[PDB]
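TEACHING EXERCISE
Course module: macromolecular assemblies
Task: Read the component lines below, then compare them to the predicted structure of the full complex.
Student: A.B.
Group: 4
Components provided:
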Amino acid sequence: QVQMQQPGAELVKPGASVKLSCKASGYTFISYWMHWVKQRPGRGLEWIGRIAPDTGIIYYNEKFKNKATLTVDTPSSTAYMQLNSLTSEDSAVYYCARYLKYDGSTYRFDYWGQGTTLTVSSAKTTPPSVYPLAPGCTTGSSVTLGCLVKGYFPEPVTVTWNSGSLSSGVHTFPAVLQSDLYTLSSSVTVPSPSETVTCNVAHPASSTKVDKKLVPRDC
Amino acid sequence: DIVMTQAAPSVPVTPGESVSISCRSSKSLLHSNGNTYLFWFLQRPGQSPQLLIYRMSNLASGVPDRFSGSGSGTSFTLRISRVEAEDVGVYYCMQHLEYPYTFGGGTKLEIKRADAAPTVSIFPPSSEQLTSGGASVVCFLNNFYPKDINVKWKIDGSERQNGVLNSWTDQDSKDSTYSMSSTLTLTKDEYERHNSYTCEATKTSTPIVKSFNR
Amino acid sequence: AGLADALTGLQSLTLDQSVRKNEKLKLAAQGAEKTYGNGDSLNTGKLKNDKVSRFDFIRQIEVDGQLITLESGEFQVYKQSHSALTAFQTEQIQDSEHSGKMVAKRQFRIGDIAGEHTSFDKLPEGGRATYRGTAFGSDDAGGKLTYTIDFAAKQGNGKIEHLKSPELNVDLAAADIKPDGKRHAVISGSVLYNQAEKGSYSLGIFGGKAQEVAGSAEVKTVNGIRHIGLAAKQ
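Instructor-supplied answer key:
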């Protein structure tokens, strides 16, 4: 029952400071060290540091010496990374991973956090606008339905179809930034009573979820 | 600082074949205790990295036996035996022998699938979109290969290049195919200034168009 | 009398300090292994007197479905008629604070000293006793310890000889016999190598007639700390 709860995303003005949390459950927190990894968009992974809830010794990377401050709350299992004087080069995905302090085990970098998407910009948080897309005809073996998610900020968004029931034939396309706002599209291919298709789009930054039901357009 | 070099940014392999990924270091990863402290990870699109190989040889929990880890002190290799569409992603090698922990540059698995014709779907703007003052025409080109395929937009028989935004997916995990979305965004006045809207796909058919008329 | 302690004087030894509450101690010899927790008795019945007896030992803990070896090496027991002490010869240990890797660190440590404690108020009125016996440490179990207790003054002093490291052939400085919280006869004093104080030492008096002494010594050699186990009898 390993669980690494990380916030979906965090938006902060440049030059400020933010605390990123990583809550742990399902394993004995004290015996496991906690590592943090940074991945810039379209780039590789970079190791930031390691915290030890047992002792408190923190091994940093030389690059992130003045940029990161690691803390641990062992009573209520949680790790925190404080980032100060945030610049654009710090907007990235930050993962927390566990690492058993003892050799001899598979419990080293086996479980990872979902990753917090830290965006550093002055723009305001904007919830997405969701539009359904249906054919306007003749239905063959399968049909393609769409969910268009326009005008949101910041990344990411999670698109599911029928609350995860339809997990095959789904194509989620990467977001595109157009005039400082994000647009995304999703397609579902479903074979042609009690059947319905609905796209649920969740924006973690605005803590919102919009369900749009795919219904035939008026003809 | 231990430098981990992944020589190949990308690596090609036809489906069903076998393939190797090379990782190199600056110091030997063999500690005095005898364990070679090398981790291999796979990152699927939009997902956190998943543990693949620990101690340079041993497979993780619920990971197929087709993955193999070899290498001695400075040169290491990850071998995929019978590549499947699910194995696509970006592979990383990270040392946990000496602080700071250093990751590899990254090697992308690129499956060389047979050429596929995209399925093209064209979606006119929705009602709520029209009441909001804009109009985005959406085009989905699904399940095509190779990635060389581009899209053309035609408004009343004339090509349009302004107002078009393209987004490409990566290799599908059950098809080894690609998908692309093209959004042509216009003001409602411009959308009502024309009649016909056409989306065209430009390597196994030469061509494939889908159009709608208001 | 079990069979997993009968692998090959004092009959029972409660393991309290040598294994903490959260871990387990696995002792193996001649292809037979027994596991002990905190407070478990260790049957020293089949063990022979005045000989340092070795077992292979691992210290094991459970962390979410996997056995973890904290340390491994040799477990040494010295058994006498009324006292017994145990030591830990470490061959591999986990650096749970710096690197997280198992390291072949050779290190000595003394875990438990037990036996029939001589009551401080029931000590002999006067006279002198001399205890000869064994001092052991890392890589050397052949050290000779000669101690002498004057019960008239309630004092003791001794020497260690024939140790492989010449810097550990120390003089055991004169120290007073004192009672513990439970009123047990204990001596604690300094360590004199080459007319200089090079560490500390402690011994306890064991047996109804004070026939045995057993304890530990800690020496500051050029290489740092050095743990020695001491046990002598009449």
